[PDB]
Structures are given as structure tokens and as C-alpha cells.
Design brief:
This is part of a larger assembly, with one copy of chain A (120 residues), one copy of chain B (156 residues), two copies of chain C, one copy of chain D (439 residues) and one copy of chain E (139 residues). Chain B has seven helices and four strands. Chain B is of the alpha+beta class and 156 residues long. Chain B has two domains: 6-65, NADH-quinone oxidoreductase subunit E (Arc Repressor Mutant, subunit A); 77-153, Glutaredoxin, CATH 3.40.30.10. A four-stranded mixed beta sheet of chain B has the order 2-1-3-4, with helices on one face. In chain B, helix 1 packs antiparallel against helix 2 (26-37) and helix 2 (26-37) packs across helix 3. Chain C has 225 residues and is mainly beta. Chain C has a domain at 128-224: Beta Barrel (Barwin-like endoglucanases), CATH 2.40.40.20. Helix content of chain C is 4%, strand content 17%. Chain C contains two helices and eight strands. A six-stranded mixed barrel of chain C has the order 3-7-4-6-5-8. A two-stranded parallel ribbon of chain C has the order 1-2. In chain C, strand 5 and strand 6 form a beta hairpin. Helix content of chain D is 39%, strand content 10%. Chain D has 17 helices and eight strands. In chain D, the strands form two sheets. A four-stranded parallel beta sheet of chain D has the order 3-2-1-4, sandwiched between helices. Chain D has a four-stranded mixed beta sheet with strand order 6-5-8-7, with helices on one face. In chain D, helix 2 crosses helix 9 and helix 14 (352-369) packs antiparallel against helix 15 (377-387). Chain E has 139 residues and is α/β, with parallel strands linked by helices. Classes of the chains: A mainly beta (120), B alpha+beta (156), C mainly beta (225), D alpha/beta (439), E alpha/beta (139). Chain C binds chain E through residues 17-18, 60, 62, 64, and chain E through 72-73, 75. The complex binds 1,4-dihydronicotinamide adenine dinucleotide (NAI), flavin mononucleotide, iron/sulfur cluster (5 copies) and FE2/S2 (inorganic) cluster (FES) (2 copies).
Chain lengths: 120, 156, 225, 439, 139, 226
């Protein structure tokens, strides 16, 4: 959701992202880049993620010939599935309305009541 | 496209004569519009604001604060049954069940023909004669679930 | 006359216990990745030889620091704009060590004389229109109209006409009239202005094509196009 | 039961056929004599002092001294604009006394408003009446017209030169409007949020002017004091609270009604000798002395005099002194849920504890009603009762809201504990994250 | 009482011995969450206090730590002597199973303390590191 | 005036209330509805301190520090257990209906409600029921509206109507359905409507021009400019 908590929780400062928004109102990263020549693989960004989007996976084979190719953009990070957390959806908890989930359709949320309603 | 009638405006100004501030006639102006039209539509807020000289936000806040000013359309008759403590002791729940069975609606809703709108209300100050309801201007006491179908048929 | 601008802010050698003033908060992030798409090597931190601030978080932004220029308010536990309460001597008062800015002049010991140049009353002359200035908070300042978020907020370019003058010219509200100023004919839609005195036409100052210098100028051949 | 004018100052002139008493019949039965004496032979300060030493306390439910409230209007002569407001809202559940007072005796209220406005030097008087009292409004407007056409209202009343104008202001259905500062805010045409005191309404009330807000029954007690004297009113009952109060029991009793009794009458006499006791097949369980905002009391407190000090020392309040009886068939959790639902939906929304904590108690009691309560619910209700007390909220609506909840938890805890069946669960499982199993 | 509670450690017998030897006004006791008594000593009495602790019946035999602190940006210094810099000496008595933190306050211009190496030889590298990182000169 | 907070004596201004006097001394009291430029109303009920009648007093009474004058010889306590419990309870009551919105809310990292939730020490949720929900309004190109995050602190209406003189923003509704906004969708007409994003302690009113290219406060490079 491009909330920038992983980037600030990084003690090396090797995460850089910018928030963009769609027409329905959901937040997403416009870009998301990680300097892996700087990353110490400490897992603080995964620990700080409130949506369990950023994750550290069992993969160590990451060697490279040039250091510029250790900057991984969003096309090098986004995978096709949920990863280690298979069922969490942050937008099912958030009160912010997006496509396919209107106001009051989140978890533990009542339907909105107009102030013009006749009920006391 | 809302316009205030001559009688409504004259009644509102006569209510404004009673107070040292024109703002003090907002509740009575909303009640005048409600009595003439059943409910208070969206343009009535701006019309009352323009007549009274107060902002429309104040009129809307007053109209939405008070439960007996209707900002949503209602039926031709408003049933208001009491769900307070003494009528709960006297068994208002049978009355509410009979009303929901006859009218086929939940409280806060209007019938399909626009005849009745069912509403719970606070204590009516008739607790010794409970359970009580109040249809449009008449308060009915000593209610029984068997008297509800006969009582509702006299309000055409 | 401008000799008081020296005390507006201290010079570039001003320090708070030997350290400069931080421009960004201490938890500023992305230092090794925000420019990594251009080059993986982190560049030099920019040097500010002009002022006492540093283009980094390696500075002072303490609420009790003896300074008047505060780039932003932050106290531990007060991340909102309520940290300014920590940055003031008393809450709702001044800053702790005075407010920034110095008046260039004091009030004079003696005043001026009375201005005897009393003008005559406005006479609406035939064939000419006095340009009454209409200002808008969104549209009159030059740099603010360039901001693309303002075009949704700036009003449509109108021309304000008194009802008697509009009836004399046979123009309703919304119709286009064309007028020539400095030999340049432009057209604008008419808005009826009840409070505008007759013989005057009201122009929105600072908009596109209407310079603010046009306030008080006379308008010729104002006629429906 | 015989009702002499000496011992029944308020209800001795009630008609047998429950019909309103108009101006001719009211004046025949000693009408406006106290108003005549006050407006001809007495100074306004003399009337204020007479009410002050008559011991007339506020009949709204708090018991504040009416003469003391009248005394602390300002003595400045530049404040010639003064307002007297009659609190005919009466939106408390279990309270129906003012409806009987103004439906069939409107001229008593008009006379008391006249006397109090002359004593307070009040140039205008408003009757803030609830919109659900249609017949009361009709009778009040007819009585005001009758008093105006007969010279009791308007300009130059009884030739003394005192001008008093009386208006009836019908409300729009909100319980918080009965609070006197919220009553003033509603009279000014605003949202009926209460006001912080000090300053009190007597210094700067309606439209910034000195304003005195008083209940219907207090202004109905005023003319008897002004007509028969202070010595008669102080000798009605041998109790600390002087005069007579409209008491009565409601709810599944043989004779649910309303009577005028001297102070110090025990609650068992109102239940047995007047209400006839409980109905057949129903056994007495509890009672509320003064409406929906008072603490529940058991059968052991039934032998207690209906005074402010006696009920206050028992852990409750006298309130409006209109008691409500609860039998064994009524579940206490459902009754308290109904009470809290009323109190939560009649919140004005100004301040956080009432607005955001009464719905929490409502939801807890709803869960307890269907057996879906969880451990910590009763502790949450007790914490809500402690933290919604006097001084913690902006007005006194929420202390009255949490009084029945704490009294029912104190006396009937075994009914609240019966609703706790499910184990506590605020969190669901998230796949891949091991929970922090707190012990 | 929890283990993290702020204690002044005035019931420590080392405080009473120091008060009896040097006087009640010779030092300032600081309440901390370090668990050890923190005592602010004047600079001219530092070697005397170190010798007195070295010649105790159950002496403080090990200089555990010795370093400095830049106190110029420290806003909350309530109950502390006025210091631009400070030098702290952590000493451990194994026989008492105790430890004491002496603190010497230095002004910004007069940044020199007497050397502690004649009492504890590890003060050589400790004072070299204090001088390297803080600029505090040890005479 | 002479006041005693937690046994410590302070000299303050007697014409000030206790909240601004104690905040001027550096003491921390949580508050929502009070603003230095708007005065005290006693709405949010967050600033509760415990006042004592005199020097020797153990019971005390929870008073409202924004509504209590800092008179001479006052005795109050901020870190009293009952006062701290009530302030945490007020935060908890505000958080019963608050949406799980901090990652996707522009007030994140700049939120007074976040600061006071953390500062009271409330981090455990025992409320298990539903949260109330509000639809939003279009307030123009500058202010973005999200009524779910409201705590009903009445700062917006007080500033916009009483202070800034605006007429198109008000409070509507009732008990816990109080709605702060315009009577209909439309641009906020006031020339000082932008100060709502700093007046609002939550993310109900947010800078929409900032929201188009959003970054958090810790990620900003700031300068003092004119
Ligand atoms: N329908 C009804 O009759 C209802 C009655 N109540 C009653 O309301 C009572 C609480 O009323 P409140 O006005 O909130 O509380 P309160 O007891 O503080 O005030 C009662 C009266 O005393 C006056 N007063 C108190 N202290 C004063 C002072 N220092 N100077 C001048 N005047 C002063 C107030 O102006 C008011 O008229 C409860 O005891 C309850 O029984 C509550 C709900 C409904
Ligand atoms: C929430 C609340 C509701 C109240 N409602 C009423 C009411 O409906 N009628 C009334 O006379 N007093 C009501 N009161 C009491 C008034 O504040 C006030 O005491 C009374 O109207 C006049 O005082 P009096 O008893 O001296 O006549 C209410 C008080 C509160 C706190
Ligand atoms: S694992 Fe890498 S990217 Fe994540 S916080 Fe640690 S250093 Fe930063
Ligand atoms: S990866 Fe997670 S922590 Fe980082 S911006 Fe996205 S949602 Fe926030
Ligand atoms: S307690 Fe607070 S929210 Fe409730 S009615 Fe009173 S002022 Fe309004
Ligand atoms: S307003 Fe504050 S608490 Fe609410 S979602 Fe936004 S940042 Fe979080
Ligand atoms: S919208 Fe913001 S300023 Fe207004 S009451 Fe809600 S939280 Fe307070
Ligand atoms: S409780 Fe229903 S009329 Fe009073
Ligand atoms: S800040 Fe005092 S009650 Fe809100």
C-alpha cells in the first residue's frame, strides 16, 4: 500500500518507494526499489510491514557482476503469489473504500448510517 | 427545485417575531415545513436558511440533530411506539411484533403503499397507561397485540 | 534603508553548540536507494555554504536550541503540528527565543501633512467604461495560476456589468461581449453585478489576458460580439 | 380520597371527569389570588425571599433550592432583559407528572410563571415543552389566550405596570433538551448541546441575558406558597424537604398512577396503600425511585421515606419521585439493556465518554442477553460505570445512564454472570504468524 | 520494587564511607537506572577518591570502564552539575560484589583531567580512546 | 499564580487554564478538542488531571485541565493512577470505532491521535464489536475528506465557523453518528479552509495536493521559507 514503513524501518536506508493511487482509491507503489548491495538482510522491513507485502524468502543465490544490477526495481520484486503469508489481506481490514469493497464491507464494520435517517 | 409557499413564509416570519434572534425560529420553521409537506426536503434547508439569515449548515445540523424533524421521506401516517423501560416492563415487544406482522416492515421503514412508517420513540410520558404508541397526533394507550389491527384501520 | 536585513537571520557561521541546523528529520530514510536508479554510488551530500542549515539530518532541531528559524516542528512523542507547543516559550505565544524577522523601520517622530488632493465624484461618461478591479485569491497572483491544481479552483474569466448598463447595451447574463484595450479586442461572458455602480465594468485582475495594471483604466467600444 | 386545599395544594382542583380547568372555574376555586397578592402587595425581592424561606426545592429531580437559584441573578439594573423558562420537556422514562400538571391545570402553570417572572423581574417567559404533548400545548395556548384577554398577561398586569409575555415553544423530540443549558441552546435554535457551568444561566443564559430555568411542578408549587403563605407551606410535612411532591408507582401494579403526597412518605405506602401492590401472579423484585436515571433498590429499601437525603443515603436518588416497580418475570440484563439503549441513543454527541462508551455498554448487554458474553464484560461494565460518573463527562446525562447499570450489577450480579458463556476472542488466526499467547 | 526502578543507592556503604572521608558536600549522588551508585566527584579530588576506593577494607580493585560523554546537547540534566563534557570511571569491587560510577564534569574550554594510570594501568588505553574520540586531555 | 503539579511547585499565569499552563512548563497532558487559538470547550474529555483541595488531600477529583483555571495555590496531579487510567480509557473509547487505516492514511506519522494513543500507553484492544462507518464527501480540489477517522473533537467546526467565519461546514447528526462536513458535496468556500488539515488532529481533512504525491513527514526535507 506504499505506506513507507519498511523504508524508514531500514537501518541502512536501502528502500526507496513512491506512493501512487488508482481511480478507485487504492494505494500502491509507483516504484519500489531496493539497493541489495546495501541490504544487510536483517528482516526489519518484513517485521515492519503492516500488510505483509515485503518478505524475505529462502533464497541466497544473489551474486552479480555489476553493482548497478543489484538495484532491484518493482518488476524484479513483485511475485505472482502471497508467499509466506497465504491469506492476509490488509484491505479487508482497512476502512478506506476501494474497488470491490465499499464502506462498511470491511471486517468488524457496521453499515454506514446517514444523519438523515429516521431512526433515533 | 424547492420554493417556500406564502403560508409557510408568513408562519416562519410570525415565529421569528417571538424571539430576539431570528436563529431561534429554526426548529419551528423546520416543523412548519414538516407539517405542510410531511418531511423536510433538501431544498427546504436552504430556503429556511435564506429566510432566517443563518447558514444552511446550521439548519442542516438542527434538522439532523432532532429526531422528530424528518430529513427522509415518510408515509402518510407515522406510527411511533415507545420502547422505553416502563413499556418494556408492560410488554411493548408484543405490540412491536404485531405492528411488524401487520405492516410487513421493520422499524424505520415505510410500507409499499406509503401509508404507514414505523418508528421507535423515547418515553411518551404515559407510563402508567403503557404500552403507548403515538400515531400522527393521537397517543394510544393500554395497547394489546389484538387491538393493533383494529386500531391501524382507522388511519386511512 | 535596507540595512536592517542583516538581522533577519544569522549568517552561515551560526551554530548551535558547534553543529548546524537540520533540514530533514533524524529518521530520514532511503539515503542509499533514493538515487540508486541513476547510479548505485551515493553522491556527495550537498554543501550549503550560503546559510546555517545543512542538507542532511546531521544538524540541530532541538526545541530548546537558541535559534529563531525553525524548519519544522518535532518533539519525541509529538509528531503532529502540536510540537510547536514544545517549540514556544508559552503555548499560543511567541517562539522561545523570539520570532524571526526584523522591522526595517521604526515609527516616525513626526507625521505627514494632510493630502489636499480631494478627487471629484465619479461621472459615468458615454462611450467609456471605468475598469473596476476584481481580485481573486485563486487567480490574481502571477505564480499561483501556473499551479495546475488552481485551474479547477480559479473562476471562469467574466466581465462584471451593472444591470442598468447591461440593459442599456441589451446584453443578458452569460452572453459574450468584446472590448478593445490597447488595440486588442478580447471577448468575455457577462456576469450581472448588482453592487457595481453604473458606468463601470468589472474585470478580474491578474487572470489570463487581463493585467493588474488595467485597474482604473478606461475601456472603449465594449459591445456584444 | 378527599383532597382538601390545605394538604393538596396542587391536585385539589382537579376535575373528576379528567377535564381541563379553564379560567372561570380556576378563578372560582381560588385562582390568581397569590398572583394578585404578589403583584400588588409584595416586592420582587420579597417574593424571592418568601420562596427562599419556604424551602421550595427544585422538582426537576436535583432538589436545588428555587429561592437560592432566584437569588443569584445579577443585581445590576442595566440588565433589564430577563428570561424565565419552564422546563416542560419531561423526557425521562417513567416520568409523567408534568403531563398531568399541564394537561388539566394549565392556569396553575400560567399563574406560577407570572409570579416567578414578577419576582425575577423577567420580561419574557418561554415554556419549552416537548412536541409529543399535543393536548398540553393546546390547553396551554388556550389558557394563555384566556389570561391575556382577561388582563392576567400582556402589558400592565393588574395595573402595576409590569409587562410579561408568555410563549409556548414546542420541541422536536430529543431527550437532552431537558438539560437546562441544552434547553437554552435549543431555545436559541441551535443543536441542544449543554453548556459548561460556571457561568450559570442565571448570570448569562438565554441570548446572554439572565435566565432562570425551572420545572413545571416548581412553578406549580409557587402559587400555593404565594396564596397561603410561608408558614402554611413549612407546616405541611415535618421533614427537611418542605411541601408536597407528585409521587407514584408505575409498572405491573394494581393501580399505576400519580398522587400528590407530602415528603417523607415511605415508598411502601405508595406501592401498597396507593398503587395497590403488585399484580396477581407477580412478585416484587426491585424498584427505581426517580425514573430511568436512578439506581435500582431492593425490597429492603421499600421502607424508606421519599426524601432526597434518605434515598441519597441508600445509594440512589429521589429524582422525579416517580418510582417504577420491577417484578420477577423481568430479566435484569434485558431491562438494563433497554435503559442503556435509550441512554446511548439520546446522547447529544458532545463528549467522548457518554458518546463512545454508552454504545460499548449497549453492545456488551446485547451480548449478555443472548448468552454471547465473554470474560471481561462485567469488568468492562464496572469500569464504564466508574469512568462515566459525575465530573468525568460534560453533563449529567451519563452518570444517570450508568446508575442503573451499576446498581443492577451490585444487586443482581448472578443474572449478568449467566450471560458469559463463550470464551474471550478478539483476534482470529493469521496463517504464518504465531500469536503472542498471553497468560 | 522492580529491578528497573530508579535508585539513588544512598544506602550503599560506599556512599557513607565517602561522606565520612571527604564530607557531605564533596560530591553529588545521581539517581539512575544503572543499578550502581553514580557519584559526581570534583576534578581536583578525583585521584584522592580513587586512592580512597583502592585502600578500602574490601577495595575497588578493577577499573571496569573509563570514557567520556558530550553533555552539551543533553536537555534533561536535572540534579546534575553543570557540565559541557563528562568523564565516567566505572570501578568494580569483587569482594563486595559492588561497583561505583564516578563522574567528573568538565567545561568546554578546560578539557583536561588528571590521568588515572597511576591507580589503574588500563586507564592508558581508556584515556587514549577518550582523547581520540572526545578531545579530552589527560595530564 | 502558584501551582503544584505532582508535588513540584511552579509559577504560572493565573489567567491561563491548567492545560496551557502545564504544556508551557513542559509537562505532557494529552488533549484533542483544545487549541491555543480556539480556546477551551471541554469536549474530548482527554485532558483529565486530578485536583486536590489543599496540600494534604488523598482523594482528589478528576477535573478538566483545559476547563480549570490555573489559580494561585492550585494542587493537581498528572501521573495519578486514576487520571492515567481515565485518559487511557478516553483514548480507548475514541479507538473503538477508528478504522484500521494508518498505512493508507495521509495523517500517518503526523497524527495527533496516533501520538496521544501512544502517549497514554493504550496498545491492547479488548473491544470486539463493530465499528461505525461514514460515507465521504467531495470538498473540492484542496481538502480530502474521510469521516471514518473522526474522533468528534469539534475542532473543525469551531475553527471554520467561530474563528474563520465560514458558513458551509458544520456538525450534523446525533449521539455517535455526528458528521462533520458540508451540507452537500461541493468546494469549501472559505479562503482559510486549508488550515483544517492542521486543525484536524486526525486524517479526516487532508491536503489533497500533497496526497497526489504523498510522502511521510520523516521523509521530507524542510526549510523555513516565506
Ligand atoms: N425529566 C426529568 O425530570 C429529568 C430530571 N433529571 C434530574 O436532573 C438532575 C441533574 O440536573 P443538573 O442540572 O444536570 O444538575 P445540578 O444538580 O447541578 O443542577 C440543578 C439545578 O441547580 C442549579 N445550580 C446548581 N448549582 C448551582 C450553583 N452553584 N449556582 C447556581 N445554580 C446552581 C442549576 O442551575 C440547575 O437549575 C438529576 O438529579 C436528575 O434527577 C434528569 C433527567 C430527566
Ligand atoms: C440529561 C438531563 C435531562 C434533564 N431533563 C429534564 C427535563 O426533561 N425536565 C426538567 O424539568 N428537568 C430536566 N433536567 C434537570 C434540569 O437540568 C434542571 O435541573 C431543571 O430543568 C430545572 O431545575 P429545577 O429542578 O430547580 O426546576 C435534566 C437534567 C439532565 C442532566
Ligand atoms: S532486510 Fe535489508 S531492506 Fe530490509 S530492513 Fe534490513 S537492511 Fe533494510
Ligand atoms: S512493503 Fe509494506 S511496509 Fe513497505 S510501503 Fe509497502 S505496505 Fe508499507
Ligand atoms: S454526557 Fe456528553 S455527549 Fe452525553 S449528553 Fe451530556 S454532553 Fe452530550
Ligand atoms: S487519522 Fe491517525 S489514527 Fe486514524 S488512520 Fe490516520 S494516522 Fe491512523
Ligand atoms: S473532523 Fe477532525 S477536527 Fe473535526 S471533530 Fe473530527 S477529528 Fe476533530
Ligand atoms: S416508558 Fe413508555 S410511555 Fe414512558
Ligand atoms: S482538551 Fe480538555 S476536554 Fe478536550
Amino acid at each position: 500500500v506504499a505506506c513507507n514503513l519498511c523504508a524508514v524501518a531500514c537501518p541502512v536506508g536501502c528502500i526507496s518507494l513512491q506512493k501512487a493511487e488508482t481511480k478507485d482509491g487504492r494505494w500502491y507503489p509507483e516504484f519500489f526499489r531496493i539497493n541489495f548491495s546495501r541490504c544487510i538482510f536483517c528482516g526489519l522491513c518484513e517485521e515492519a510491514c503492516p500488510t505483509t507485502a515485503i518478505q524475505l524468502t529462502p533464497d541466497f543465490e544473489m551474486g552479480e557482476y555489476k553493482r548497478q544490477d543489484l538495484v532491484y526495481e518493482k518488476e524484479d520484486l513483485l511475485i505472482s503469489g502471497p508467499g509466506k503469508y497465504p491469506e492476509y489481506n490488509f484491505y479487508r481490514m482497512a476502512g478506506m473504500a476501494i474497488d470491490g469493497k465499499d464502506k462498511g464491507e470491511a471486517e468488524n464494520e457496521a453499515k454506514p448510517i446517514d444523519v438523515k435517517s429516521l431512526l433515533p | 427545485a424547492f420554493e417556500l409557499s406564502a403560508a409557510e413564509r408568513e408562519a416562519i416570519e410570525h415565529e421569528m417575531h417571538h424571539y430576539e434572534d431570528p436563529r431561534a425560529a429554526s426548529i419551528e420553521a423546520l416543523k412548519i415545513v414538516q407539517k405542510q409537506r410531511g418531511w423536510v426536503p433538501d431544498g427546504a434547508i436552504h430556503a429556511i436558511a435564506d429566510v432566517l439569515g443563518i447558514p444552511a449548515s446550521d439548519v442542516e445540523g438542527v434538522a439532523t440533530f432532532y429526531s422528530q424533524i424528518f430529513r427522509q421521506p415518510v408515509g402518510r401516517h407515522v406510527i411511533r411506539y415507545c420502547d422505553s423501560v416502563v413499556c418494556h416492563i408492560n410488554g411493548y415487544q408484543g405490540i412491536q411484533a404485531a405492528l411488524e406482522k401487520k405492516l410487513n416492515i421493520k422499524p424505520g421503514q415505510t410500507t409499499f403503499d406509503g401509508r404507514f412508517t414505523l418508528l421507535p420513540t423515547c418515553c411518551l410520558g404515559n407510563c402508567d397507561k403503557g404500552p403507548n404508541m403515538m400515531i400522527d397526533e393521537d397517543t394510544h394507550a393500554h395497547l394489546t397485540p389484538e387491538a393493533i389491527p383494529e386500531l391501524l384501520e382507522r388511519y386511512k | 534603508e535596507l540595512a536592517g536585513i542583516k538581522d533577519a537571520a544569522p549568517d552561515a557561521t551560526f551554530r548551535i553548540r558547534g553543529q548546524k541546523l537540520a533540514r530533514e528529520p533524524h529518521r530520514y530514510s532511503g539515503r542509499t536507494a533514493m538515487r540508486a536508479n541513476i547510479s548505485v554510488h551515493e553522491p556527495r551530500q550537498p554543501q550549503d555554504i550560503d546559510t546555517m542549515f545543512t542538507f542532511s539530518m546531521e544538524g540541530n532541531n532541538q526545541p530548546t536550541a537558541h535559534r529563531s528559524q525553525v524548519p519544522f516542528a518535532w518533539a519525541p512523542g509529538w509528531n503532529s503540528p502540536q510540537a510547536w507547543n514544545k517549540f514556544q516559550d508559552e503555548v499560543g505565544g511567541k517562539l522561545r527565543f523570539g520570532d524571526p524577522g526584523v522591522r526595517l523601520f521604526e515609527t516616525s517622530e513626526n507625521g505627514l501633512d494632510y493630502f489636499t488632493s480631494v478627487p471629484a465624484r465619479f461621472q459615468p461618461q458615454d462611450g467609456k467604461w471605468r475598469i473596476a478591479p476584481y481580485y481573486h485569491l485563486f487567480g490574481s497572483d502571477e505564480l499561483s495560476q501556473r499551479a495546475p491544481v488552481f485551474q479547477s479552483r480559479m473562476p471562469q474569466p467574466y466581465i462584471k456589468l451593472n444591470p442598468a448598463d447591461a440593459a442599456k447595451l441589451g446584453v443578458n447574463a452569460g452572453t459574450r461581449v468584446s472590448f478593445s484595450y490597447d488595440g486588442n479586442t478580447v471577448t468575455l461572458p457577462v456576469e450581472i453585478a448588482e453592487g457595481l455602480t453604473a458606468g463601470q465594468v468589472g474585470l478580474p485582475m491578474g487572470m489570463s489576458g487581463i493585467a493588474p495594471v488595467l485597474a482604473g483604466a478606461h475601456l472603449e467600444d465594449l459591445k456584444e460580439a | 380520597i378527599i383532597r382538601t386545599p390545605e394538604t393538596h395544594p396542587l391536585t385539589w382542583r382537579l376535575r373528576d371527569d379528567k377535564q381541563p380547568v379553564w379560567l372561570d372555574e380556576y378563578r372560582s376555586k381560588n385562582g390568581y389570588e397569590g398572583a394578585r397578592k404578589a403583584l400588588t402587595g409584595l416586592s420582587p425581592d420579597e417574593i424571592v425571599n418568601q420562596v427562599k424561606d419556604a424551602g421550595l426545592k427544585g422538582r426537576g429531580g436535583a432538589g436545588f433550592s428555587t429561592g437560592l437559584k432566584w437569588s443569584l441573578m445579577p443585581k445590576d439594573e442595566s440588565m433589564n432583559i430577563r428570561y424565565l423558562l419552564c422546563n416542560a420537556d419531561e423526557m425521562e422514562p417513567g416520568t409523567y407528572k408534568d403531563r398531568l400538571l399541564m394537561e388539566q391545570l394549565p392556569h396553575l402553570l400560567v399563574e406560577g410563571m407570572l409570579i416567578s417572572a414578577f419576582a425575577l423581574k423577567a420580561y419574557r417567559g418561554y415554556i419549552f415543552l416537548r412536541g409529543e404533548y399535543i393536548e398540553a400545548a393546546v390547553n396551554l395556548r388556550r389558557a394563555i389566550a384566556e389570561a391575556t384577554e382577561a388582563g392576567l398577561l400582556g402589558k400592565n398586569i393588574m395595573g402595576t405596570g409590569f409587562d410579561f409575555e408568555l410563549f409556548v415553544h414546542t420541541g422536536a423530540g430529543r431527550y437532552i433538551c431537558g438539560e437546562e443549558t441544552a434547553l437554552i441552546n435549543s431555545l436559541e435554535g441551535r443543536r441542544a448541546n449543554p453548556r459548561s457551568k460556571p457561568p450559570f444561566p442565571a448570570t448569562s443564559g438565554a441570548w446572554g441575558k439572565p435566565t432562570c430555568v425551572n420545572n413545571v411542578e416548581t412553578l406549580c408549587n409557587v402559587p400555593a406558597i404565594l396564596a397561603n403563605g410561608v408558614e402554611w407551606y413549612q407546616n405541611i410535612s415535618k421533614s427537611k424537604d418542605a411541601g408536597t411532591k407528585l409521587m407514584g408507582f408505575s409498572g405491573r401494579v394494581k393501580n399505576p398512577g400519580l398522587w400528590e403526597l407530602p415528603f417523607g412518605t415511605t415508598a411502601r405506602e405508595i406501592l401498597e396503600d396507593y398503587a395497590g401492590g403488585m399484580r396477581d401472579g407477580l412478585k416484587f423484585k426491585a424498584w427505581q425511585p426517580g425514573g430511568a436515571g436512578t439506581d435500582f433498590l431492593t425490597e429492603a429499601h421499600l421502607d424508606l421515606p421519599m426524601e432526597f437525603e434518605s434515598i441519597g443515603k441508600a445509594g440512589s436518588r429521589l429524582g422525579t419521585a416517580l418510582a417504577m416497580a420491577v417484578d420477577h418475570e423481568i430479566n435484569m440484563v434485558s431491562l438494563v439493556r433497554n435503559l442503556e439503549e435509550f441512554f446511548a441513543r439520546e446522547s447529544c454527541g458532545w463528549c467522548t465518554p457518554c458518546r463512545d462508551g454508552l454504545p460499548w455498554s449497549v453492545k456488551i448487554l446485547r451480548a449478555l442477553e443472548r448468552g454471547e458474553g465473554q470474560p471481561g464484560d462485567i469488568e468492562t461494565l464496572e469500569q464504564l460505570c466508574r469512568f462515566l460518573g459525575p465530573g468525568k463527562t460534560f453533563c449529567a446525562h451519563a452518570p444517570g445512564a450508568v446508575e442503573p447499570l451499576q446498581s443492577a450489577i451490585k444487586y443482581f450480579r448472578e443474572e449478568f454472570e449467566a450471560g458469559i458463556k463463550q470464551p474471550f476472542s478478539n483476534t482470529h488466526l493469521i496463517n504464518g504468524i504465531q500469536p503472542n499467547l498471553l497468560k | 520494587e522492580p529491578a528497573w526502578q530508579t535508585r539513588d543507592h544512598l544506602d550503599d556503604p560506599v556512599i557513607g564511607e565517602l561522606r565520612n572521608r571527604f564530607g557531605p558536600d564533596a560530591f553529588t549522588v545521581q539517581a539512575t537506572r544503572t543499578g550502581v551508585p553514580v557519584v559526581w566527584i570534583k576534578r581536583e579530588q578525583l585521584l584522592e577518591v580513587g586512592d580512597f576506593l583502592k585502600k578500602l577494607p574490601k577495595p575497588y580493585v578493577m577499573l571496569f570502564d573509563l570514557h567520556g560523554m558530550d553533555e552539551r546537547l543533553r536537555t534533561h540534566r536535572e540534579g546534575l552539575p553543570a557540565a559541557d563534557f563528562s568523564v565516567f570511571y566505572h570501578l568494580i569491587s569483587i569482594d563486595r560484589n559492588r561497583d561505583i560510577m564516578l563522574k567528573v564534569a568538565l567545561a568546554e574550554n578546560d578539557l583536561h583531567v588528571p590521568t588515572f594510570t597511576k591507580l589503574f594501568p588500563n586507564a592508558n588505553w581508556y584515556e587514549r580512546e577518550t582523547w581520540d574520540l572526545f578531545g579530552i586531555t589527560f595530564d | 499564580a502558584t501551582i503544584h503539579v505532582d508535588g513540584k511547585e511552579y509559577e504560572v499565569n493565573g489567567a491561563d487554564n491548567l492545560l496551557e499552563a502545564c504544556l508551557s512548563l513542559g509537562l505532557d497532558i494529552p488533549y484533542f478538542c483544545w487549541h491555543p487559538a480556539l480556546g477551551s470547550v471541554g469536549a474530548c474529555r482527554q485532558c483529565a488531571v486530578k485536583q486536590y483541595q489543599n496540600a494534604e488531600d488523598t482523594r482528589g477529583r478528576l477535573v478538566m485541565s483545559c476547563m480549570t483555571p490555573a489559580s494561585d495555590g492550585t494542587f493537581i496531579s498528572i501521573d495519578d493512577e486514576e487520571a492515567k487510567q481515565f485518559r487511557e480509557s478516553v483514548v480507548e473509547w475514541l479507538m473503538t470505532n477508528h478504522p484500521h487505516d494508518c498505512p493508507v492514511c495521509e495523517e500517518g506519522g503526523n497524527c495527533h491521535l496516533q501520538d496521544m494513543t501512544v502517549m497514554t500507553g493504550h496498545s491492547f484492544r479488548r473491544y470486539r464489536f463493530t465499528k461505525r462507518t461514514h460515507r465521504n464527501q467531495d470538498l473540492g480540489p484542496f481538502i480530502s475528506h474521510e469521516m471514518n477517522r473522526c474522533i468528534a473533537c469539534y475542532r473543525c467546526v469551531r475553527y471554520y465557523k467561530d474563528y474563520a467565519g465560514g458558513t458551509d461546514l458544520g456538525v450534523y447528526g446525533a449521539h455517535d453518528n455526528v458528521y462533520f462536513g458540508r451540507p452537500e458535496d461541493g468546494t469549501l468556500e472559505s479562503e482559510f479552509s486549508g488550515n483544517l488539515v492542521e486543525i484536524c488532529p486526525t486524517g479526516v481533512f487532508t491536503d489533497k495536493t500533497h496526497s497526489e504525491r504523498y510522502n511521510r513527514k520523516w521523509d521530507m526535507q524542510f526549510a523555513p521559507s516565506i
